[model samples]
Target chain A: ETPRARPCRVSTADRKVRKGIMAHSLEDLLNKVQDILKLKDKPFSLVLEEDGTIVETEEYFQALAKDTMFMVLLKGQKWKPP
Target chain B: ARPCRVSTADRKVRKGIMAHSLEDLLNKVQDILKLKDKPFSLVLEEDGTIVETEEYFQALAKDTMFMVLLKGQKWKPP
Candidate 1:
């Protein structure tokens, strides 16, 4: 009774199911996103700093789905702010 | 602030910034794919499951960088 991430045509009795857990993979999600935005050993900021990176890709053919259901993008690369 | 339902503009020229009196022209722009790695602390927990939220004061009183935004989605073919 713990497979709770469902949000399509939602009506498992109007589901707003919760309890989130499995979250950290892909090299621990990019090394915990550079250690929670501490940005590694630093020294790359030339003023343009509004970066948000998490992009993954793997598509092929008519492709109805799955092969890890691949694709992720949280990229808002608007810079200028060291 | 999350006044849902709208599509492809034209609720009388994107009646955002508040509909005032069209009776019903909701759709507070959030064509949600998703992009919230963080942002929480809904103290009361807003009835328990609030994560990666949207609708920041209805997007800064519906400014949204001079209007023109929309949400609700479909039709995704690989």
Candidate 2:
């Protein structure tokens, strides 16, 4: 059996299904999300569907998705280099 | 040196939404469907007020609400 995380829909700015994953790191998940959305080199931000706030941390997937549903939204945002 | 058309190494993916061709559109659709069954991962935020916007960008002017630049930005990756 796999100790994988629950599957949740990653919705785009318009709330469309983007992609799915299991036991993925927050950074990798966001990277894949950008890849799927074709925003690979584009500026964008992610929001949680429950509260629609910014995904401030990259450690989200360490422990996630209990009995509740999870959703992430992708929208256009500013891209600044470090 | 001038930019080369085929070589993307010297160029940046400029911003702004523009109309695109339908080429490979269906192919990508099929690709999405193919990967639909794959396992998913998500660490969710708490349920609360609609922090961004409930309307979901009904108009282009709403871009700033998401910390997004309405004028669009183009930059290089690190």
Candidate 3:
């Protein structure tokens, strides 16, 4: 059976660039972002763009809206409003 | 909300198509848009990544906007 998928918008902390991604899980989402943004070999975090709430669990990730906006922050980067 | 929204090449026509699977969505899109019998593909609106798999189609969140491109048609920013 195919897993449920969610489409969301992801962007850099600066919000200058963005991409739409379909994610099955949190890990999948992170990996896709890493590949798309070319943040090779760097640790990163996904957070809600509306607030700086870090997404850590699969449940939380699954609960997000279909078109939710997420911010991708590499190590030492923090989320800021655009 | 519906499973997703689909737009025509010119983006002048748009409608929400329920998602059951990739094939189902494609058939529905064709019927709703009155597309020709030729092959068509769906791509993300933000970027032109073609969605060609059932896994990718299932992962699409409800109400995601996508474009329906006929064969030889390319995706462009709106």
Candidate 4:
């Protein structure tokens, strides 16, 4: 199934339920997550996806071969070098 | 017999330009053609490890079931 027609299962922590959306790319997927989660000000990080692989780069998302699920966690804190 | 395939795009030619890895392929052609500032896309395929045309088809098939996109751009506004 092509990306546009494929139904992506998106979920959050403490919840097993998922919502389906047609996404063309990981970029498109993130945009949708931001809208669904109502992300504002606070930065978010993708903690997990299919196969429970630790998230790294957007290319990881694009590297999927199946319709996938994702978990996004709010970053607790930040440490910037002075 | 397994059909011919490549790790990257399979005979995917964008506007007659063959695509191995969309970015590298695009970049290569861009530099070769000097379209440095040109904007474009990888057609339709998602993005993944490109295969060789002469390699086994299973690799291509597995990759497809894994992650891959088709080339679907014409290099001009419609």
B-chain TM-scores per prediction: 0.19, 0.17, 0.85, 0.26
Q: Provide backbone clash counts, one per model.
A: 3, 5, 4, 17
Which digits, one per residue and each the tens of the lDDT, describe model 1 over residues A1-82? 1132211110011122221112223333333322333332422211101232222321111122111111112233233221
> Per-residue lDDT for B1-78 in model 2, tens only?
111111011122322221121122212322332322221211111211111211211111212211111122221222
Cα lDDT of model 1 overall? Answer: 0.22
DockQ of each: 0.04, 0.02, 0.18, 0.02
Order of the predicted models by DockQ, top scorer first:
3, 1, 2, 4
**Distance from true location, Cα of A20 in model 2, Å:** 1.4
Lowest-sum lDDT 10-residue window in model 4 chain A: A73-82
Among the numbered candidates, top DockQ falls to 3
- Kindly list the per-residue Cα lDDT of model 1 for residues B1-78, writing each as its tens digit: 223222222223322233332122222233221212211221011122211223222222233222222233211211
Error of 4 at A61 (Å): 1.0
TM-score for predicted model 3 compared with the true structure:
0.54
Model 4: docking quality category: incorrect
- After superposition, the stretches of candidate 2 with alpha carbons farther than 4 Å from their true spots are A1-8, A40-43, A66-82, B1-78
Write the number of the candidate with greater lDDT, choosing between 2 and 3.
3
DockQ for candidate 2, please give it.
0.02
* Model 4: residue A26 alpha-carbon error in angstroms: 1.8
Scored against the true structure, residue A30 in model 3 reaches a CA lDDT of 82
Worst 10-residue lDDT window, candidate 2 chain B:
B1-10
Whichever of 1 and 4 has more TM-score, that candidate is 4
**Mind giving the per-residue lDDT tens digits that candidate 2 earns over A1-82?**
2334334345555443333333245655555655554543632555555555566564554444432223444344422221
TM-score ranking, best first: 3, 4, 2, 1
Query: What RMSD value applies to candidate 3?
Result: 5.9
